[PDB]
Design a binder for this molecule. Sequence first.
Ligand SMILES: [Cu+2]
Ligand SMILES: [Cu+2]
Ligand SMILES: [Cu+2]
Ligand SMILES: [Cu+2]
Ligand SMILES: [Cu+2]
Ligand SMILES: [Cu+2]
Lengths: 336, 336, 335
Amino acid sequence: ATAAEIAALPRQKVELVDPPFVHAHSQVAEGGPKVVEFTMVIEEKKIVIDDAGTEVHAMAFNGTVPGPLMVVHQDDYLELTLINPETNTLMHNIDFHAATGALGGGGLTEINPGEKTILRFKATKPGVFVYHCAPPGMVPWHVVSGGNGAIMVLPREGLHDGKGKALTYDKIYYVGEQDFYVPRDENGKYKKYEAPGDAYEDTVKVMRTLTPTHVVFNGAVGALTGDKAMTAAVGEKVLIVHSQANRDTRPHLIGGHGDYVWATGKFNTPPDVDQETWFIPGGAAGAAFYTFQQPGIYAYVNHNLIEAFELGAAAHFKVTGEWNDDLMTSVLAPSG
Amino acid sequence: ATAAEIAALPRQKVELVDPPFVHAHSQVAEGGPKVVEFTMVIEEKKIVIDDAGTEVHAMAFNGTVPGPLMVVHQDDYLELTLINPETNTLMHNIDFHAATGALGGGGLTEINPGEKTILRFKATKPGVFVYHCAPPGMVPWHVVSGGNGAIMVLPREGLHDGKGKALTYDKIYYVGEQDFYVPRDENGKYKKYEAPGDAYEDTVKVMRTLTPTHVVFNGAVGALTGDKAMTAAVGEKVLIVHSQANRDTRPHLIGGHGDYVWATGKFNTPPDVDQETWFIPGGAAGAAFYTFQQPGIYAYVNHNLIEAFELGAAAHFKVTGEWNDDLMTSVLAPSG
Amino acid sequence: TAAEIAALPRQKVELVDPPFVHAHSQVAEGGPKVVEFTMVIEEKKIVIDDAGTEVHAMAFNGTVPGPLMVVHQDDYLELTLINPETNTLMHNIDFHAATGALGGGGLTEINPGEKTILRFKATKPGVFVYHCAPPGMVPWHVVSGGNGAIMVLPREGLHDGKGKALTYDKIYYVGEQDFYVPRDENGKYKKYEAPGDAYEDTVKVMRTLTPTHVVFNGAVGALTGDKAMTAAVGEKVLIVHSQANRDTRPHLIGGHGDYVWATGKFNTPPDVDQETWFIPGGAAGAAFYTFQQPGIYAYVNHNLIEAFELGAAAHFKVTGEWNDDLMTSVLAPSG
Ligand SMILES: [Cu+2]
Ligand SMILES: [Cu+2]
Ligand SMILES: [Cu+2]
Ligand SMILES: [Cu+2]
Ligand SMILES: [Cu+2]
Ligand SMILES: [Cu+2]
């Protein structure tokens, strides 16, 4: 399209919501190509990531870790207004894996505190894609401080399975998984700092071990459990988008499956089916589609079970409905 | 189906055999749906995992690490009697990744020492699948203590390639790969403990490094070598099922290939072909099909070669038959 | 038959150093051939970072990685492998592309002062790792740089999942190397007189499963600056990537993998529109991209710690006209 043709396209302002929820959208596109507009203020803030009061100096797109899911359709334009407030201490930017050119946008969005920028790109490829901060020379530090999220570029005709039959979800959730590298002192206690820059040297040493101290969903241990469990009902079709900007993960729904899984995250690559545990490499997003068949509590984990149950990578689903004894029954309950 | 319909189905009791062998079965299902009955006693037992005499207090389903391969067909019911004898010290249970509901059966099979339970589930999805112990609060410890195995749910019509041609194996082996995390003293020598619980805190610290001390097939360094090498002949068709309940692996047949590989382990997902090295994520099983073409020794390995040759993840195949000079020949043997 | 193999033509090919690739055609020119290559193994001290860090490398043909060899399906690859008397160690070669004798390793064990000639039929199309594998010291040789890859093209060239031609304008081979360099108690990397002197110290580092360096073409920054790879807008590029010992996850920053044979095998249909692909330790993969935008790109292992702290980052410098439809700065950074 020409500059004039794009200027004539309809504009739609989207209001982002905090993960794991996803802003309102249509699966099948409602009309022709649009310029879909998003705004995000980058907030540098302390976050507490475990029950020992361990702190991270986060880079929080839109005030969350992960940053929110942005949803467009293929051949829409995504126009982001990105704002770095004067209260921040560092330069930041954004690299959309979904975009083409200038290091994903990173080369065009370097904004110091007190500045803002507007980037527009054409979402030419359908899929879920990571986005993340990437300041030259400081890239991994910003990403593992929580400066990452994802977007979903739906096909204009919605999702389909490998034979072209429609796949339509009732619910969608976004799980951002984060590897943290928190320095400790001589007695094994996690260190606290009063400024992001103060922890840099110490953090780089931990990162070089390639061994995260914490691996969490939605910014902290237990962030998606207890009261913040995701919900569904028997019969409901659910899409779980999962991202990891820096490090591999292997998602698994304990008690369920991935009926369809775009493990590469790309919708023109047909989905795998009947999956127990799928694999998303660092620097990517994937998506799984599941129809719940049984009520009760499910745990959704990175199935390196040390990472899930020692380091923090575990979420819950609470599911309502009728139990199915054909699928599963206790013939003899635990007894002497 | 209804409870009455299921009660009318024929039962068959299966005697399990120790890995890497697999109990007698038919590739193409005999008749209609059955309730296939297995019994497994859990044994907490000391095992020796290397040639120095390093020992682990294992949780051994049916007395082995890994637990044995159970084989059924799609839409059969798997009915497991699981027994925790009173000589054991801990509660155990079982999570079938093949099953749907109650955390894979885990929520319905918590048995203290002196107790037993019978769980039945419908095997609705075809593939190979991990099973493992998963007691709330103690999940990874039980799994990395060897409390895991796999099942195979064959399609009722046996295996096929991605395009409808039958794939019929002459023999099958099950390779269970185990990451162990054995505490060490100040001399770098592995510690021994009197009971399972005594090793807990020390073991958890090693687990947090995400760096196993040992990575082994069939419970020990060298377990599938020497006179315990797997065997085949030129022309023979072999399926190798490979599981890893906690941690990634990358199987490779040195001198061979995976002609067809269900790397996700799921038979409705078409197999990759002509593979050098395939990839199975932690928490999953995979399967590879190969027709041997050359005689001699092969090594089957996790192709992180440090993991294979330093940590223990190497097995051998001994293959009988005639050398094929068309496929490979030494034009000039090593000479001055 | 026997007479027929003996009657097949023999063609010698001159190798070139990575990331460049020797002369070849995408569609096979003629019928099956015996393609002959020669490689001398060089044990040499190489410098892998900006602080003068040394490794005693095993360098097939004098490079880390060893060079890319390119044949077509059902050609034979006939390698002459030479281990000069100035070397201290036995070496050999295992072609993942080959069938039999541990990939050739059982037939190619050459002491210093010896050579050997191995021939194998390239029956399976794809990119494949090769590496040294002396029994009992396999990982040491591989993580000392003793590895490369080959490409076995389909006789009819590359195709997408639907059967239409994919023809590249150029090809690069990126070999990625995990190194495990011992450090003294002060945190400084150690140097050794001879390869064997480092064995014990190196195996201890290997057992951490934590590389001190992860690099492309044998050193930090080997494919950056004046050594960046090049392309132009409109050009179709194939990037072959190998890792003989450890997982990697390639990503073209600012681009994509339009078609990616992530397993490296051409009979397995390529994934499409990839952001970041995955190649397991012990394999090669291949990505095809058509460049749409000019400028500098970084090509990385997208564990960004591995890329930017440990060394796994390369550059492409791309010429041509910018496309404001695909991307534009509506408002540049401003107060
Ligand atoms: Cu930032
Ligand atoms: Cu990136
Ligand atoms: Cu247990
Ligand atoms: Cu599990
Ligand atoms: Cu060597
Ligand atoms: Cu190999």
